[PDB]
Amino acid sequence: SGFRKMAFPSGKVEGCMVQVTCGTTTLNGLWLDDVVYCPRHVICTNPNYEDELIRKSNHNFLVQAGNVQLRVIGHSMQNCVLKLKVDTANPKTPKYKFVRIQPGQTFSVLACYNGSPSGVYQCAMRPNFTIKGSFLNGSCGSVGFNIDYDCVSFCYMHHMELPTGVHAGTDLEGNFYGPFVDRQTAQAAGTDTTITVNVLAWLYAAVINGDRWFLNRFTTTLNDFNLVAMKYNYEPLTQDHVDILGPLSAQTGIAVLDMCASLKELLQNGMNGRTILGSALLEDEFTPFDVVRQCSGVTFQ
Amino acid sequence: SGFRKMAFPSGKVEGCMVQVTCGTTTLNGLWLDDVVYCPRHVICTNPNYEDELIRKSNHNFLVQAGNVQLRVIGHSMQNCVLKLKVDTANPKTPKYKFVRIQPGQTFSVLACYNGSPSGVYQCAMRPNFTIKGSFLNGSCGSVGFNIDYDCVSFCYMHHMELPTGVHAGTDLEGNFYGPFVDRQTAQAAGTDTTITVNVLAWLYAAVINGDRWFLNRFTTTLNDFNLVAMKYNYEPLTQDHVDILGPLSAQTGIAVLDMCASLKELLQNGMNGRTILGSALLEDEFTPFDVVRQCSGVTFQ
Ligand SMILES: *[C@H](O)[C@H](C[C@@H]1CCNC1=O)NC(=O)[C@H](CC1CCCCC1)NC(=O)[C@@H](NC(=O)OCc1ccccc1)[C@@H](C)OC(C)(C)C
Ligand SMILES: *[C@H](O)[C@H](C[C@@H]1CCNC1=O)NC(=O)[C@H](CC1CCCCC1)NC(=O)[C@@H](NC(=O)OCc1ccccc1)[C@@H](C)OC(C)(C)C
């Protein structure tokens, strides 16, 4: 038992991180087979990136993989990611996919500087398409990812920080999450909401782990629940969310809508000096899958 | 910016995990050079382990490293760890040390089942020598560790769960942290305390990240602070702790004892509907080193 904010093992991704240097800019790149993916704002001189990139030569891109300098033999831009063709395929290339995740989905971030991993932590895509990361200068190109059995599904690459201290980036095909653009003009996150289905998942994690104090006898209708959710800036719970919460409901014997009744009282009364799973806040960065994964011990080969 | 519960990159450790099977027991082992370390309670039949181990043959130990079965050519017991001599040195053996950490120190846990990594998370050694882990059956032998530049310092190997849902284990030389013994007789954690110096470190993390609302004009004496700390079940702050908090004090311009004044008011008034670094509780599982590492971007080769 116990319940932790758990990241995926990072080794498969560590084996792909490289340093990409162009001009006075150093950031991280992702080396899969013979391509290095990195944010396009690595390039030189309201930017027009097509113009900027046409002015570049391959030898402008210094790619360091450990103590090995990688030779760029071509380059292309796909949306906001640059793809550097290199003459060597990464022998550590895992089995991988590129996936564009939905808000509310979680992932592990391997924070990197100069191609070297610094730390790993779990993140959710917020409803406003930011992530509350931990990122300093030089962390651009760090990726977020999930693992399924043996496949690394990359879903995030870091581009920029917004004035509230949250972070914005793209999928690995270079499409920003949210309305953000890779130019240093004024942009702001947008008002966020709490990921309701994930809070319910974490309440089920709590029950699985022996916390039951927040339960009640009541029930609620989905309609009636969503009316309370909106008042507290929670995402509407859909029937799909209810269905996704099925396995957790079945394992605990607590109907989804009964858990919704508990959450409603938690929203209306607070927790009154008590904690759930070591938290004094309602936690929303565990998906139903995360809960089931951690509470049943799924591993990855 | 941003501040996350960040674990070390786990890949160097993932490359060492193996499955150890003996009788009807399967758990994890740590393969470094030609030795596999695992909890001694893996062996068969108030146990007397010397008697139990003398009755064993090498071929009773099934060691799986991926799809490769490792041959045990010898075995010995050191405290509560078993060491299985195998005929193959792990080629992925990182540079490593074994270290016995002090309560309050943090580490990353690579949770494993059947030799396969499941997840990574950050943990502290509690003052009562438990850890609040996330561990199911089969996770024994998962290790906790820190990384310094390129060296993996192993400090924890998982043995058992206690009735409160917390966890007890040993250093990699098999010495339990705390008074615990590896027998299924009644044992209990002991009353825990909050790791004061770490709370102060995390308040400095908060300031570094733009949270200043909890600061005040006041100061306090170490004596006067510790008198309030004890009332709230906090560890005494020592002058060594104050000195360790020097770099963070110097970077933020907030004298340690001034931060102690802030913590005292936080203890006395609560936070009153406000959060610090996304938490509604005073967080104590970041060491001063953790804060400086994350807020300045130290990486690991
Ligand atoms: C790449 O390593 C860094 C990572 C940043 C650095 C600090 N934390 C991070 O996550 N990325 C940047 O430094 C990028 C670089 C530009 C990205 C767009 C194309 C040109 C290069 N810049 C930012 O992340 C800045 N954010 C920003 O400009 O946002 C739009 C904006 C502009 C003006 C007002 C409001 C919003 C950051 C560094 O600037 C602030 C932290 C001041 C917001
Ligand atoms: C190894 O993979 C598991 C990991 C456990 C399983 C659940 N969570 C974990 O972290 N370890 C065990 O299952 C060990 C095995 C014994 C360890 C001592 C030597 C003999 C094998 N057992 C426990 O971890 C149990 N704890 C325990 O017995 O503690 C002492 C005790 C005994 C009686 C009353 C109170 C305390 C766990 C599995 O039992 C409880 C969860 C019921 C405490």
Curated annotation (Swiss-Prot), chains A, B:
Protein activity control: Inhibited by pyridone-containing alpha-ketoamides compounds 13a and 13b. In turn, alpha-ketoamide 13b (tert-butyl (1-((S)-1-(((S)-4-(benzylamino)-3,4-dioxo-1-((S)-2-oxopyrrolidin-3-yl)butan-2-yl)amino)-3-cyclopropyl-1-oxopropan-2-yl)-2-oxo-1,2-dihydropyridin-3-yl)carbamate) inhibits SARS-CoV-2 replication in human lung cells. Inhibited ex vivo by michael acceptor inhibitor N3. Inhibited ex vivo by compound 11a and 11b.
Superkingdom of origin: Viruses
Covalent link Glycyl lysine isopeptide (Lys-Gly) (interchain with G-Cter in ubiquitin), residues: 5, 85
Stretches of the chain found on the membrane's Cytoplasmic side: 1-301
Role description: Cleaves the C-terminus of replicase polyprotein at 11 sites. Recognizes substrates containing the core sequence [ILMVF]-Q-|-[SGACN]. Cleaves and inactivates human TRMT1, preventing tRNA guanine(26)-dimethylation of tRNAs. May cleave human NLRP1 in lung epithelial cells, thereby activating the NLRP1 inflammasome pathway. May cleave human GSDMD, triggering alternative GSDME-mediated epithelial cell death upon activation of the NLRP1 inflammasome, which may enhance the release interleukins 1B, 6, 16 and 18. Also able to bind an ADP-ribose-1''-phosphate (ADRP).
Reaction(s) catalysed (UniProt annotation): TSAVLQ-|-SGFRK-NH2 and SGVTFQ-|-GKFKK the two peptides corresponding to the two self-cleavage sites of the SARS 3C-like proteinase are the two most reactive peptide substrates. The enzyme exhibits a strong preference for substrates containing Gln at P1 position and Leu at P2 position
Protein name: 3C-like proteinase nsp5
Localization per record: Host cytoplasm; Host Golgi apparatus; Host nucleus
Peptidase C30 domain segment(s): 1-301
Active-site residues per Swiss-Prot or TrEMBL entry: 41, 140
Residues of the full protein shown: 3264 to 3569 of 7096
Mutagenesis or variant effect for residue 184 to A: Does not affect ability to cleave and inactivate human TRMT1
Species assigned in the record: Severe acute respiratory syndrome coronavirus 2 (2019-nCoV)
Quaternary structure and partners: 3CL-PRO exists as monomer and homodimer. Only the homodimer shows catalytic activity. Interacts with host FBXO22; this interaction promotes the proteasomal degradation of nsp5.
Gene: rep
